[PDB]
């Protein structure tokens, strides 16, 4: 029941997310939801994530395929393993001139899931090779 | 089904048991000969061989602890997912790292996992290599 509602939770969250519905996104989050970004900072709350998706998508657009989802169970943490295919379509900071170029990793992210909604998100990938791929 | 998961993650929490003893036969025995090894931020390595240098190599400048271990796994039970929180000191300089003299971090990590027929065929490692470095230089 819990391991079903709480991958469910997360299969929705990323099938928002490769529609491109932020909205439907936040809606499954806590309103002081912890966003770890890889090799970064913790910030917290939705309008944080909200602003961290929309500054992704001035430069970036992606998707997430094959993503494998695991969980306890008492589905109250979630595991997801993905492959991110994607276009750097606007020149962004610290990165050379958008081209079109296309990008294709390995990522991971794991979810506390709590009073029915997601109050963690801590992404993973290698950045190191991200950066190789967008030059 | 749940008996594939429950393989699955008794598997790998035994794997984290046996790293938290340092116990590297053991994690070892639950690898498979062809096991690839996803270092954070880093290249593949693949084989028993390497992986047994590595725990060598790493044992050599650090000391770790796992704490927090929750491991989660797929109803096939062929891909497992692990959170955990180190807690570790850097001893003895490790090859193009600031200088070791003891520096304390914790930390979270994760891992994920291909599980074929009770055995580990991939570990994947994560964390916060700038949040590590930030620790270690403090
Ligand atoms: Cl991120
Ligand atoms: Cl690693
Ligand atoms: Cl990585
Ligand atoms: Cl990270």
Same mark, same amino acid.
């Given at each position: 029941?819990?391991?079903?509602? =709480?991958?469910?939770?997360?299969?929705?969250?990323?099938?928002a997310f490769? #529609?491109?519905?932020?909205?439907?996104?936040? =809606?499954?989050? =806590?309103?002081? +939801?912890?966003?770890?970004?890889?090799?970064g900072?913790?910030?917290? !709350? #939705?309008?944080?994530?909200?602003?961290?998706?929309?500054?992704?998508?001035?430069?970036?657009?992606?998707?997430?395929?094959?993503?494998?989802?695991?969980?306890?169970?008492?589905?109250?943490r +979630?595991?997801?393993?993905? +492959?991110?295919? !994607?276009?750097?379509?606007t020149?962004?900071?610290?990165?050379?001139? =958008?081209? !079109?170029?296309?990008?294709?990793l390995?990522? !991971?992210?794991?979810?506390?899931?709590?009073?029915?909604?997601?109050?963690? +998100?801590?992404?993973?990938?290698?950045?190191?090779?991200?950066?190789?791929?967008?030059?």
């Amino acid at each position: 029941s819990n391991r079903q509602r =709480a991958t469910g939770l997360v299969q929705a969250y990323y099938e928002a997310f490769n #529609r491109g519905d932020w909205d439907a996104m936040l =809606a499954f989050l =806590a309103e002081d +939801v912890a966003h770890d970004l890889n090799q970064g900072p913790r910030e917290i !709350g #939705r309008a944080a994530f909200a602003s961290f998706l929309q500054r992704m998508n001035d430069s970036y657009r992606e998707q997430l395929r094959d993503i494998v989802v695991t969980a306890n169970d008492e589905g109250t943490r +979630v595991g997801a393993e993905y +492959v991110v295919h !994607g276009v750097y379509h606007t020149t962004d900071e610290g990165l050379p001139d =958008a081209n !079109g170029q296309t990008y294709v990793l390995p990522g !991971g992210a794991f979810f506390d899931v709590r009073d029915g909604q997601i109050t963690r +998100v801590t992404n993973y990938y290698n950045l190191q090779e991200w950066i190789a791929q967008v030059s």
